[PDB]
Design a protein around this ligand. Structure first.
Ligand SMILES: NS(=O)(=O)c1ccc(NC(=O)C[C@]23C[C@H]4C[C@H](C[C@H](C4)C2)C3)cc1
Ligand SMILES: [Zn+2]
Length: 257
C-alpha cells in the first residue's frame, strides 16, 4: 500500500491514484510575489469555542485528533468560503530534520512541520459525501517553525507515548484547538486536493501567513512515533509530507498586502 518510503512514496502514488497528476493537486509552493491580493476576500471566521475533541489516533501515516462533528460545534466560515464548514480532525506533517516537513512551501522555503485543521461543508451531510465535491472541504494550514514552545500543543505532545504505533488510539477529550493558532489570521487561498491518497480534488486550502513556533523537544516527540504497528519492525514516523505539486491553471489569492 501507499506510504512515504522509496518504494511506496509520492512518486508512486499516481499508479493507484491517477488523480495525483490532476489539475488541482496539493500542496503547492506559494510564491509570495505572484500571489494576488484580493480586497474582496472576507476575514476568516474561526469559531472553536464549543469544540468537542474525542480521541487521538495513530493511523499509520500521521496522528489525528478527532472531533464531534455531528453538530455545529467548531466551525470555519468566511474567507473565500460560502456556508459552514465543521471541524472533523486535525493532524500534522513533519520532517526528520528541522529544515523540512511542511507540505506547502513559501518562496520554496520549507517549515519544520505543517498543521492541518480539516473541515467539511455541512450542506453535503457527511464527510464521505463532502470529499466527492469540489467545494466539499476546507483545510486550514498552519506552518510550524522550531523556536519557543507552543503551550497549547503540549497536551498533544504528552499523549503521543500512548499512540506510538499504527492503530493505537487514546481518549483525548476537552482539548482546545484555539491554542494552536497564531495571532494573525492573514491567509493565502487556492483550490486544491487532499495531500495523501485518495488525493481527491475537494479542498479549499486556506494557509495562514504567520507560522506558530514549537520547541525542539516538541517536534522531537513527533519523530518518536512509528509508521508501523506494534510487533512489526520499527520505522520512525518522519517525513510524512508530499512535496509541492505544479500550480497549473490556478492563482493563489492573498487576504492581505
Ligand atoms: N493532508 S489533508 O489534510 O489534505 C488530508 C485530510 C484527510 C485525508 N483522508 C481522510 O480523511 C480519510 C478518508 C478515507 C476514505 C476516503 C476519504 C473519505 C473518507 C473515507 C475519509 C478519505 C487525507 C488527507
Ligand atoms: Zn494533512
Amino acid at each position: 500500500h501507499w506510504g512515504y518510503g522509496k518504494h511506496n512514496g509520492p512518486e508512486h502514488w499516481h499508479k493507484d491514484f491517477p488523480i495525483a497528476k490532476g489539475e488541482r493537486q496539493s500542496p503547492v509552493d506559494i510564491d509570495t510575489h505572484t500571489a494576488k491580493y484580493d480586497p474582496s476576500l472576507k476575514p476568516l471566521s474561526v469559531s472553536y469555542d464549543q469544540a468537542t475533541s474525542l480521541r487521538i489516533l495513530n493511523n499509520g501515516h500521521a496522528f489525528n485528533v478527532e472531533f464531534d462533528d455531528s453538530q455545529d460545534k467548531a466551525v470555519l466560515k468566511g474567507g473565500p468560503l460560502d456556508g459552514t464548514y465543521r471541524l472533523i480532525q486535525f493532524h500534522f506533517h513533519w520532517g526528520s530534520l528541522d529544515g523540512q516537513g511542511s507540505e506547502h512551501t513559501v518562496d520554496k522555503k520549507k517549515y519544520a512541520a505543517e498543521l492541518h485543521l480539516v473541515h467539511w461543508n455541512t450542506k453535503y451531510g457527511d464527510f464521505g459525501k463532502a470529499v466527492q465535491q469540489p467545494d466539499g472541504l476546507a483545510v486550514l494550514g498552519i506552518f510550524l517553525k522550531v523556536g519557543s514552545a507552543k503551550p497549547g500543543l503540549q497536551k498533544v505532545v504528552d499523549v503521543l507515548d500512548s499512540i506510538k504505533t499504527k492503530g493505537k488510539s487514546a481518549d483525548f477529550t476537552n482539548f482546545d484547538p484555539r491554542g494552536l493558532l497564531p495571532e494573525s489570521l492573514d491567509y493565502w487561498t487556492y483550490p486544491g486536493s487532499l495531500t495523501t491518497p485518495p488525493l481527491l480534488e475537494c479542498v479549499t486550502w486556506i494557509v495562514l501567513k504567520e507560522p506558530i513556533s514549537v520547541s525542539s523537544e516538541q517536534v522531537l516527540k513527533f519523530r518518536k512515533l512509528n509508521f508501523n504497528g506494534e510487533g512489526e519492525p520499527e520505522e520512525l514516523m518522519v517525513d510524512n509530507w508530499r512535496p509541492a505539486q505544479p500550480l497549473k491553471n490556478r492563482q493563489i489569492k492573498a487576504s492581505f498586502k
